Write an enzyme that holds these catalytic residues in place. Structure first.
Site, PDB file in Angstrom:
ATOM      1  N   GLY A   1       0.810  -1.206   0.000  1.00 30.97           N
ATOM      2  CA  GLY A   1       0.000   0.000   0.000  1.00 30.97           C
ATOM      3  C   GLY A   1       0.845   1.259   0.000  1.00 30.97           C
ATOM      4  O   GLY A   1       0.517   2.241  -0.674  1.00 30.97           O
TER       5      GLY A   1
ATOM      6  N   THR B   1       2.054 -12.907  -0.546  1.00 31.86           N
ATOM      7  CA  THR B   1       1.474 -11.851  -1.359  1.00 31.86           C
ATOM      8  C   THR B   1       0.050 -11.582  -0.903  1.00 31.86           C
ATOM      9  O   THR B   1      -0.749 -12.516  -0.783  1.00 31.86           O
ATOM     10  CB  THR B   1       1.482 -12.239  -2.848  1.00 31.86           C
ATOM     11  OG1 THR B   1       2.786 -12.016  -3.404  1.00 31.86           O
ATOM     12  CG2 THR B   1       0.435 -11.428  -3.625  1.00 31.86           C
TER      13      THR B   1
ATOM     14  N   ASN C   1       9.482 -10.860  -8.497  1.00 32.14           N
ATOM     15  CA  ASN C   1       9.970 -11.698  -7.407  1.00 32.14           C
ATOM     16  C   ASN C   1       9.974 -13.174  -7.791  1.00 32.14           C
ATOM     17  O   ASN C   1      10.758 -13.958  -7.246  1.00 32.14           O
ATOM     18  CB  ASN C   1       9.117 -11.477  -6.155  1.00 32.14           C
ATOM     19  CG  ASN C   1       9.685 -10.415  -5.237  1.00 32.14           C
ATOM     20  OD1 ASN C   1      10.833  -9.996  -5.385  1.00 32.14           O
ATOM     21  ND2 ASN C   1       8.875  -9.966  -4.281  1.00 32.14           N
TER      22      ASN C   1
ATOM     23  N   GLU D   1      20.657   9.641 -20.238  1.00 31.99           N
ATOM     24  CA  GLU D   1      21.150   8.668 -21.206  1.00 31.99           C
ATOM     25  C   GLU D   1      20.340   7.379 -21.161  1.00 31.99           C
ATOM     26  O   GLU D   1      20.170   6.717 -22.191  1.00 31.99           O
ATOM     27  CB  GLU D   1      22.628   8.364 -20.955  1.00 31.99           C
ATOM     28  CG  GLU D   1      23.587   9.408 -21.501  1.00 31.99           C
ATOM     29  CD  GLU D   1      25.001   8.864 -21.675  1.00 31.99           C
ATOM     30  OE1 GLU D   1      25.147   7.710 -22.143  1.00 31.99           O
ATOM     31  OE2 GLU D   1      25.961   9.586 -21.324  1.00 31.99           O
TER      32      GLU D   1
END
Ligand SMILES: Nc1nc2c(ncn2[C@@H]2O[C@H](COP(=O)(O)OP(=O)(O)OP(=O)(O)O)[C@@H](O)[C@H]2O)c(=O)[nH]1
Ligand SMILES: O=C(Cc1ccc(-c2ccc(OCCN3CCOCC3)cc2)cn1)NCc1ccccc1
Ligand SMILES: Nc1ncnc2c1ncn2[C@@H]1O[C@H](COP(=O)(O)OP(=O)(O)CP(=O)(O)O)[C@@H](O)[C@H]1O
Ligand SMILES: Nc1nc2c(ncn2[C@@H]2O[C@H](COP(=O)(O)OP(=O)(O)O)[C@@H](O)[C@H]2O)c(=O)[nH]1
Ligand SMILES: [Ca+2]
Ligand SMILES: [Ca+2]
Ligand SMILES: [Ca+2]
Ligand SMILES: [Ca+2]
Ligand SMILES: [Mg+2]
Ligand SMILES: [Mg+2]
Ligand SMILES: [Mg+2]
EC number: 3.6.5.-
Lengths: 54, 438, 425, 349
Positions: free
Chosen positions: B144, B179, B206, B254
Site C-alpha cells: 500500500g 502476497t 519476485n 542517457e
C-alpha cells in the site's frame, strides 16, 4: 558489423556495435483530488454516525 | 559532476535500498563508519562516486538517500544496522500505521498527511547538490505504501522538479513470496498514475528472483535477504555507470535516450549472468561468450517472458570484470547467427556496450560466488508486456465481482479510478502489440 | 500496535479466561504477572496484549464484563485470576436472564457507560491502538445483547479501529434455553454491520469434535473451551510473535474480507488434542483442511473458499509446508473461487503451542458458513411463526418488527453467500 | 493426480485425447478458466501463452508451439522458405511461390511468368490463401492477369504458386491425390512421424485441358464428398492408406513407398521443423509445448515429392483416430506426467 564511439578510461571502456542499419497535473490539481477523496471519506463517516445516532 | 538522489519507499524499497547501499560501500571502499581511506580530498570533491555520496568535513561519506515507510519496523533496523551511522535521522522517515496493502490508504488517506514532510526532507538533500540529475525510486508494486505513496510522491516530484529525470526500480508481485490477494489492484493503480511521471522503470518479478535463487544458488526456500542481495547486484550493475568513470549511461537522461524511444514503453527487461552459488568451492569460470549467451536465456531474466516472440527497440550490455571489446563482438557475432533477435524496423539492430574492469563485488559470507566477469543486459523488448497481461488478467477476474473494492472506496477513492487505471493498461498492452507483432 | 480485549457474559469470560491462561504461558508470564521465560521472541510483541507495569510486571489489556458477578468471581479465583487489573472488572448484579433485550436495551444499557470508561482508559495508554477483540456467546443475554451494544458504542467512539470477535454460536445439542435462536439472530445482525472479522465457533462442532474425535463421552463446557483457547491462540499467533509476517489487524482484514458483510470465518485446528506421536507436515495440512477439524459445523465441500489463511507453528521444513499447501489446493481446486487468484496464504511461527511440537491453525472465509446461518434461521422461524416466547422480549420494550427485520437481514446474508458460491470467472 | 483444461471443443483429435485421459483414472478435467492445470488443450487463436508457467508448484504443458504459425499459414510458409539460409531460395522440394498483396513481389512473380512466357511450356499456376475454408477461394488459371484480377477481388493476402501440371496419377482412373502425414513434436523437440499416412484422392479423372471444373484437380475431403458423383467407388471416402498405396507402387512401378516417397517426406519434415526450432523450442522455458502437425504433400510423375502446406490444427482419418490419439498421450503427455513397439518413426536430428 562495425564498432563505434570507443571511449577508454582506466576503469573500463565503452562502445557501440551496429549489426544492421534501420529501415503533467499541477500542484493545485493534485491537492484538489486529494481533498476530494478526503471529503468523500468524511461524508461516508457522517452517514455512519448519523446511522448510529438513529 | 551531477548528483542523484535515491528514494526508498515501503518495506520492499527500504530493504532493497539497504542491500544496495551495503554493496555500494563495499564497491567504493567505504566503511560502515562512513570513512573512505582512498578518498584523498577530505570533505569535498567532484569524483564520480560523489554522485551518490555527499561528504562531511569530518570525512564521512553519506548516501544521498531518503528512506520512507508508513510504519517504523523496517526503517528501525536501518537505524540499528551495521551501516547505522552512515545515515542521519532526517533521512529516515517513519509513519505510525501503514497502508495495510491498500493503495488508496497509502495514496490518499495516509499519503496526504506525510507527503509535505517527505518533500521537505528531499529538499534538504537537493539543496546540497550543485547540479541535481533526478531520482532513483525503489518500491514494490503490491504494498500500500509501495504503490500508493510512491505514485503520489512521483506526482509531486514532477511538479517540484519538472526538468529532472526519474527512474524506478519496481518489485512486481509474485504469489510465492507471501502476497496480498489485492496486489494486482495496487500494481495497476500505481502504474497508471505513475506512468507519465517515470522516464525509465526496471521491473523485477519476485518470481524470477525466487527461481534464480533456487536454481542457481540452491537455496530451497529463499528469504528476502537472499532475494535482495541478488537484486542489488543487478541494481548496482545498472547504476555503476553513474558512480564510476566511463562513457556509457553517465547521465540519468542517457538511460531514456539509449533505452526508451517511446515514453510510455519505458520498461527495459534486465537479464543477468552469471549467478553462481558460493558453496561451490571451485566453479569453472564462464567466458565472455558464455555469459553473453546467457543474457538470452529466459531463465536469467528479471521477468519471465519470451523475447523471441517480440521485438527489440534498444539493447545495452554492461560488463564487469575481465572483458575486452573483441571478445564481446566475437560473442555477439555468433549469438546473432543462432538466436532469434529481431528489432523493430524503425530502429538500428545493434548493441551499446559498457565495460568496467572492476569485477563484481559480493557481500562477504553471502550466497553469491565471486566471478571474474559478469554482465547485465538491458533490453527494451515488447515481450515484457507478457507481465502486463498476467497482472491485467488477475485484475479483471477480481474486479468483475468488485471483490475487495470496498476497502479502496472506504479510503476516499472512487470506483472510477479502477476502470480508468485499467483502461490505461489496456492502451499500454496494445501499444506493445502494435510495435511488436505484424 | 496494541489490542484491547473484552470478554462479556458467562461464556465470554470463561473462554476469555482460558485464552489469557494459554497465551500467558506461551509468553512466559506467570499467574502473578512476572515474566520467567527463556526466549525473547516471547516479548518482542508482548505489548500487543499486555501492559507493562511497575517492576516489569505484565498485566493483560483485558476488560471483563458481566451483568451478574458469579462467573467473574470464579475468574478472579481461577488459575490466573490475579493477573487481571482489578479496576477492569465491570459488573452489575441483576443478570440478563438469557434475554438479548435485557443485555442490549435495559439492564446492559445501565452498565455500558462504565465499561466504555475502562475501555477509554486502556486506549488512552496505547501508543498505537490497533483495534479490539471480544469474546462472547450469541445465545445468552449479556455476551449477546450487551456484547453487541458495546460493539456499537465502541464503533461510535473509535470509528476507524478494527473490531474482531470470537463468537460462540448456539446449538440445540449444547443448549441452555429455548430462546437461543432469538438471541443469536438478533446478535448476528449487529455483527454483520459492526465487526470487521467474526470467528464463528459453533458449539455443535465443539461437541462433535469432543465426542467423535477426542473420545469423550460426556463433554463439558471445560472440554469445549480447551479447543476454543487453543484455536484463539493459533488465530492470534501471527500478531503476538516476531516473524517475517508484518501484518496488523487491518492488513489481515484487508487480505481476507472481499465484501464487507461476508466477514464470518470458519476456524480450525490440528492436531485435535485432549500425546507423543510427532505429526508430519502432510498430516498437519490434511487434518487442518478436514471438516472434522473445523469449529463451525459446516461442510467446506458444500461451498467455496473466498480466502484462506493457514498458520503453522513449530520448527518444520517450510519447503514441505509450501509443497503440502500447494498440493491440497491443486488436488481440490474447485472449492476455491477462481475470481480471487492466489487466495490461500500461509504463515509460520517457530514457537509451538505448549504440549505439541507442531500445530496448524486454519482460518477460512467460505460460503459454506451459510449453513450455520440457515440452521439458526430455521430454529428462529420455527418459534417465531407462532410468536412463541416473545413475551420475554416485548416485556423489555421490544416490538415484533425488530424480530422480523433481524430475520430478514440474516436471510439476506444467507442469499449473499449463495450468490458468490455460484459465481464463476 | 494430474489436471487438464479443454479450450478448443471443436478439435476432433483432442476431444479424443481428452476422453482417453479421463478414462485413465489419473487425469481430472477442470473448467476452462481454472489456472491450476497441468496440461492445456488450448484454443487455436490467441492462446494466452504469456499466462503459462507462472503457477507455483505446477509443471504446465500445452498442445501448441508458440511461433509455429510461421510454418502453418501459407503466406509466412513462403516467406520463411525464401528468407532462411537453412531452406534457401534454392529449395528443391517446395514449388515456386510468390506472396501478393491486394514485402510484396507482385512483379518478380510476373518476371518468372514472363520467362515461362518465353519458352512457352507449362505456365499454369494456382492462387490461394489460408482464409479459404475447405475449397473456396482457390483458383487455377493459365494466364497471370486473371489470377491477379482474382487477387485484389478480395482483401486477404494470397500466394501464387506453380501448379504441378504432371502429377502422379493412380490407375485405374487417371486420378490425382495428395498425401497427409501427421507429425508429433514433443516437449524435447523429438520429431515423431506417425507410421500411418493417408492419400486424399480425387475420384474424377485428371484433365489437363480445362481448369475451370474444380474437382479433378483439388484434393480436399469435403469437395469430393460434396461435388463428386462417383466418389467412393475406388476406396471408401476417397481415402487410400499406406499398405494399399505401397502394394500399388510395387505392382505398378516396381518400387516401394518408403524408397520412392517416404524418404523425401521425412527429409522435408525434418528440415522444416529444425529450421524454426531455435524460434519456438521450449527446452529452457517456464512452460513446455508439444504439437501435432499435418503435412500435405504432392507427388509428380517422376516420383518427386513436393510440400504443399503445413497445418497446425489438423484433423485425422477416422480409422486411425484411436491409434494416433493414444500415441499423443504416450509420447507427448505421459512423457511429462507419468502414470502407474511404437506407432511413430522418430526423425533424429
Ligand atoms: N524482493 C523483495 N520483495 C519484498 C520485500 N518486502 C516486501 N516485498 C514484496 O512486496 C509486497 C508487499 O509490499 P510491501 O513493500 O511489504 O508493502 P509496503 O510498501 O510497506 O506498504 P504497506 O502495505 O503499507 O505495508 C509483496 O509482493 C512482497 O513480495 C523485500 O524485501 N524484497
Ligand atoms: O487475521 C487474523 C487471523 C489471521 C492471521 C494471519 C493471516 C494471514 C497470514 C498470511 C498472509 O499472507 C501474507 C500477505 N503479506 C503480508 C506482508 O505484506 C506482503 C503480503 C495473509 C494473512 C490471516 N488471518 N488476525 C488475528 C486476530 C483475530 C482476531 C482477534 C485478534 C487477532
Ligand atoms: N502448386 C500446386 N500444384 C498442383 N496442384 C496443387 C498445387 N497446390 C494445390 N494443388 C491442389 O490443390 C490442393 C490443396 O490446396 P490447399 O493447399 O489450398 O489445401 P487447404 O490448405 O485449402 C485444406 P487443409 O489445410 O484443411 O488440409 C492440393 O492437394 C492439390 O491437389
Ligand atoms: N463453548 C462454550 N459455550 C458456552 C459456555 N457458557 C455458555 N455457553 C453457550 O452460550 C449459551 C449461554 O449463554 P451465556 O454466555 O451463558 O449467557 P450470558 O452470560 O448472559 O452472556 C448457550 O448457548 C451455551 O451453549 C462456555 O463456557 N463455553
Ligand atoms: Ca573527496
Ligand atoms: Ca516529467
Ligand atoms: Ca436497575
Ligand atoms: Ca459517562
Ligand atoms: Mg509496510
Ligand atoms: Mg448462562
Ligand atoms: Mg490449411
Amino acid at each position: 558489423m562495425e564498432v563505434i564511439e570507443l571511449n577508454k578510461c582506466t576503469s573500463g571502456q565503452s562502445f557501440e556495435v551496429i549489426l544492421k542499419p534501420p529501415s503533467d497535473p499541477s500542484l493545485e490539481e493534485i491537492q484538489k483530488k486529494l481533498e476530494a477523496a478526503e471529503e468523500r471519506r468524511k461524508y461516508q463517516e457522517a452517514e455512519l454516525l448519523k446511522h448510529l445516532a438513529e | 559532476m551531477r548528483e542523484c538522489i535515491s528514494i526508498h519507499v515501503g518495506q520492499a524499497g527500504v530493504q532493497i535500498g539497504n542491500a544496495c547501499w551495503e554493496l555500494y560501500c563495499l564497491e567504493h571502499g567505504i566503511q560502515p563508519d562512513g570513512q573512505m581511506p582512498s578518498d584523498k580530498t577530505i570533505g569535498g570533491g567532484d569524483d564520480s562516486f560523489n554522485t551518490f555520496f555527499s561528504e562531511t568535513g569530518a570525512g564521512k561519506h553519506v548516501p544521498r538517500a531518503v528512506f520512507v515507510d508508513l510504519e517504523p519496523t523496517v526503517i528501525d533496523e536501518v537505524r540499528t544496522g551495521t551501516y547505522r551511522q552512515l545515515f542521519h535521522p532526517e533521512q529516515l522517515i517513519t509513519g505510525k500505521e501503514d497502508a495495510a496493502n491498500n493503495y488508496a490508504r497509502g495514496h490518499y488517506t495516509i499519503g496526504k498527511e506525510i507527503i509535505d514532510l517527505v518533500l521537505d526532507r528531499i529538499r534538504k538533500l537537493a539543496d546540497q547538490c550543485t547540479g541535481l540529475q533526478g531520482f532513483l525510486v525503489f518500491h514494490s508494486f503490491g504494498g500500500g505504501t509501495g504503490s500508493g505513496f510512491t505514485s503520489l510522491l512521483m506526482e509531486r516530484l514532477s511538479v517540484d522538479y519538472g526538468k529532472k529525470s526519474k527512474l524506478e526500480f519496481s518489485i512486481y508481485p509474485a504469489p510465492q513470496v507471501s502476497t496480498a490477494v489485492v496486489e494486482p489492484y495496487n500494481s495497476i493503480l500505481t502504474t497508471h498514475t505513475t506512468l507519465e511521471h517515470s522516464d525509465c522503470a526496471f521491473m523485477v518479478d519476485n518470481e524470477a528472483i525466487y527461481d534464480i535463487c533456487r536454481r542457481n544458488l540452491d537455496i530451497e526456500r529463499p528469504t528476502y535477504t537472499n532475494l535482495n542481495r541478488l537484486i542489488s547486484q543487478i541494481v548496482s550493475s545498472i547504476t555503476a555507470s553513474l558512480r564510476f568513470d566511463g562513457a556509457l549511461n553517465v547521465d540519468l537522461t542517457e538511460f531514456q535516450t539509449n533505452l526508451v524511444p517511446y515514453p510510455r514503453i519505458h520498461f527495459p527487461l534486465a537479464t543477468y549472468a552469471p549467478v553462481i552459488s558460493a558453496e561451490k568451492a571451485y566453479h569453472e569460470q564462464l567466458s565472455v561468450a558464455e555469459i553473453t549467451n546467457a543474457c538470452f536465456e529466459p531463465a536469467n531474466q528479471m521477468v519471465k517472458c519470451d523475447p523471441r516472440h517480440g521485438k527489440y527497440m534498444a539493447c545495452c550490455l554492461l560488463y564487469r570484470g575481465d572483458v575486452v571489446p573483441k571478445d564481446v563482438n566475437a560473442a555477439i557475432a555468433t549469438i546473432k547467427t543462432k538466436r532469434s533477435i529481431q528489432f523493430v524496423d524503425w530502429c538500428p539492430t545493434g548493441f551499446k556496450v559498457g565495460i568496467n574492469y572492476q569485477p563484481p563485488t559480493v557481500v562477504p559470507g553471502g550466497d553469491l560466488a565471486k566471478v571474474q566477469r559478469a554482465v547485465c543486459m538491458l533490453s527494451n523488448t515488447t515481450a515484457i508486456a507478457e507481465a502486463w497481461a498476467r497482472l491485467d488478467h488477475k485484475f479483471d477476474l477480481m474486479y468483475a465481482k468488485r471483490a475487495f473494492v470496498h476497502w479502496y472506496v472506504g479510503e476516499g477513492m472512487e470506483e472510477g479510478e479502477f476502470s480508468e487505471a485499467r483502461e490505461d493498461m489496456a492502451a499500454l498492452e496494445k501499444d506493445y502489440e502494435e510495435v511488436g507483432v505484424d | 500496535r496494541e489490542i484491547v480485549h473484552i470478554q462479556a457474559g458467562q461464556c465470554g469470560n470463561q473462554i476469555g479466561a482460558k485464552f489469557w491462561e494459554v497465551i500467558s504461558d506461551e509468553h512466559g508470564i506467570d499467574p502473578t504477572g512476572s515474566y520467567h521465560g527463556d526466549s525473547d521472541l516471547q516479548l518482542e510483541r508482548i505489548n500487543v496484549y499486555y501492559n507493562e507495569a511497575t517492576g516489569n510486571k505484565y498485566v493483560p489489556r483485558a476488560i471483563l464484563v458481566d451483568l451478574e458477578p458469579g462467573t467473574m468471581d470464579s475468574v478472579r479465583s481461577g488459575p490466573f485470576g490475579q493477573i487481571f487489573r482489578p479496576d477492569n472488572f465491570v459488573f452489575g448484579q441483576s443478570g440478563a436472564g438469557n434475554n438479548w433485550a435485557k443485555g442490549h436495551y435495559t439492564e446492559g444499557a445501565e452498565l455500558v457507560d462504565s465499561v466504555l470508561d475502562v475501555v477509554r482508559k486502556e486506549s488512552e495508554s496505547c501508543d498505537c491502538l490497533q483495534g479490539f477483540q471480544l469474546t462472547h456467546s450469541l445465545g445468552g443475554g449479556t455476551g449477546s445483547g450487551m456484547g453487541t451494544l458495546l460493539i456499537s458504542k465502541i464503533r461510535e467512539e473509535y470509528p476507524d479501529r478494527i473490531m474482531n470477535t470470537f463468537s460462540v454460536m448456539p446449538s440445540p445439542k449444547v443448549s441452555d434455553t429455548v430462546v437461543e435462536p432469538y438471541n443469536a439472530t438478533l446478535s448476528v445482525h449487529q455483527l454483520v454491520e459492526n465487526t470487521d472479522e467474526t470467528y464463528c465457533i459453533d458449539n455443535e462442532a465443539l461437541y462433535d469434535i469432543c465426542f467423535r474425535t477426542l473420545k469423550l463421552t460426556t463433554p463439558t463446557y471445560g472440554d469445549l473451551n480447551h479447543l476454543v483457547s487453543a484455536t484463539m491462540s493459533g488465530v492470534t499467533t501471527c500478531l503476538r510473535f516476531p516473524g517475517q509476517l508484518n501484518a496488523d489487524l487491518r492488513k489481515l482484514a484487508v487480505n481476507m474480507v472481499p465484501f464487507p458483510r461476508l466477514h464470518f470465518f470458519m476456524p480450525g485446528f490440528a492436531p485435535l488434542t485432549s500425546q507423543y506421536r510427532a505429526l508430519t507436515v502432510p498430516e498437519l495440512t490434511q487434518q487442518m483442511f478436514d471438516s472434522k477439524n473445523m469449529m463451525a459445523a459446516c461442510d467446506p465441500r458444500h461451498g467455496r473458499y473466498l480466502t484462506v489463511a493457514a498458520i503453522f507453528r513449530g520448527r518444520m521444513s517450510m519447503k514441505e509446508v509450501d509443497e503440502q499447501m500447494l498440493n491440497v489446493q491443486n488436488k481440490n481446486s474447485s472449492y476455491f473461487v477462481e475470481w480471487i487468484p492466489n487466495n490461500v496464504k500461509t504463515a509460520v511461527c517457530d514457537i509451538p503451542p505448549r504440549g505439541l511440537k507442531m500445530s496448524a491453525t486454519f482460518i477460512g472465509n467460505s460460503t459454506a458458513i451459510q449453513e450455520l446461518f440457515k440452521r439458526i434461521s430455521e430454529q428462529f422461524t420455527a418459534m417465531f411463526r407462532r410468536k412463541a416466547f416473545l413475551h420475554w422480549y416485548t416485556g423489555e420494550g421490544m416490538d415484533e418488527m425488530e424480530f422480523t427485520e433481524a430475520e430478514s437481514n440474516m436471510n439476506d446474508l444467507v442469499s449473499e453467500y449463495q450468490q458468490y458460491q455460484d459465481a464463476t470467472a | 493426480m494430474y489436471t487438464f483444461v479443454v479450450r478448443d471443443e471443436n478439435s476432433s483429435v483432442y476431444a479424443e485425447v481428452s476422453r482417453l485421459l479421463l478414462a485413465t483414472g489419473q487425469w481430472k478435467r477442470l473448467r476452462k478458466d481454472n489456472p491450476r492445470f497441468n496440461l492445456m488443450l488450448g484454443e487455436r487463436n490467441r492462446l494466452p501463452f504469456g499466462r503459462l508457467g507462472h503457477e507455483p508448484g505446477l509443471v504446465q504443458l500445452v498442445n501448441y508451439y508458440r511461433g509455429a504459425d510461421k510454418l502453418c499459414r501459407k503466406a509466412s510458409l513462403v516467406k520463411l522458405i525464401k528468407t532462411s539460409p537453412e531452406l534457401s531460395e534454392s529449395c528443391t522440394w517446395f514449388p515456386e511461390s510468390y506472396v501478393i498483396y491486394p514485402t510484396d513481389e507482385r512483379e518478380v512473380f510476373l518476371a518468372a511468368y514472363n520467362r515461362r512466357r518465353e519458352g512457352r511450356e507449362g505456365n499454369v499456376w494456382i492462387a490461394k490463401s489460408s482464409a479459404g475454408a475447405k475449397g473456396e477461394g482457390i483458383l487455377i488459371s493459365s494466364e497471370a492477369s486473371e489470377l491477379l484480377d482474382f487477387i485484389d477481388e478480395q482483401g486477404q493476402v494470397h500466394v501464387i504458386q506453380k501448379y504441378l501440371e504432371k502429377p502422379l496419377l493412380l490407375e485405374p482412373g487417371h486420378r490425382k491425390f495428395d498425401i497427409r502425414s501427421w507429425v508429433l513434436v514433443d516437449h524435447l523437440y523429438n520429431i515423431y512421424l506417425y507410421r500411418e499416412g493417408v492419400l486424399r484422392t480425387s475420384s474424377e479423372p485428371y484433365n489437363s485441358a480445362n481448369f475451370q471444373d474444380k474437382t479433378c484437380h483439388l484434393t480436399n475431403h469435403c469437395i469430393q464428398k460434396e461435388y463428386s458423383k462417383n466418389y467412393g467407388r475406388y476406396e471408401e471416402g476417397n481415402e487410400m492408406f499406406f499398405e494399399e498405396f505401397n502394394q500399388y507402387l510395387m505392382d505398378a512401378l516396381n518400387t516401394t513407398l518408403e524408397n520412392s516417397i517416404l524418404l523425401q517426406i521425412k527429409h522435408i519434415i525434418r528440415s522444416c521443423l529444425m529450421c524454426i526450432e531455435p524460434a519456438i523450442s521450449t527446452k529452457h522455458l517456464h512452460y513446455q509445448s508439444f504439437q501435432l502437425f499435418g503435412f500435405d504433400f504432392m507427388v509428380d510423375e517422376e516420383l518427386k515429392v513436393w510440400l504443399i502446406e503445413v497445418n497446425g490444427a489438423p484433423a485425422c482419418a477416422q480409422k486411425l483416430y484411436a491409434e494416433l490419439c493414444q500415441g499423443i498421450v504416450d509420447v507427448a503427455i505421459s512423457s511429462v506426467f507419468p502414470l502407474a513397439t511404437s506407432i511413430f518413426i522418430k526423425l533424429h536430428h
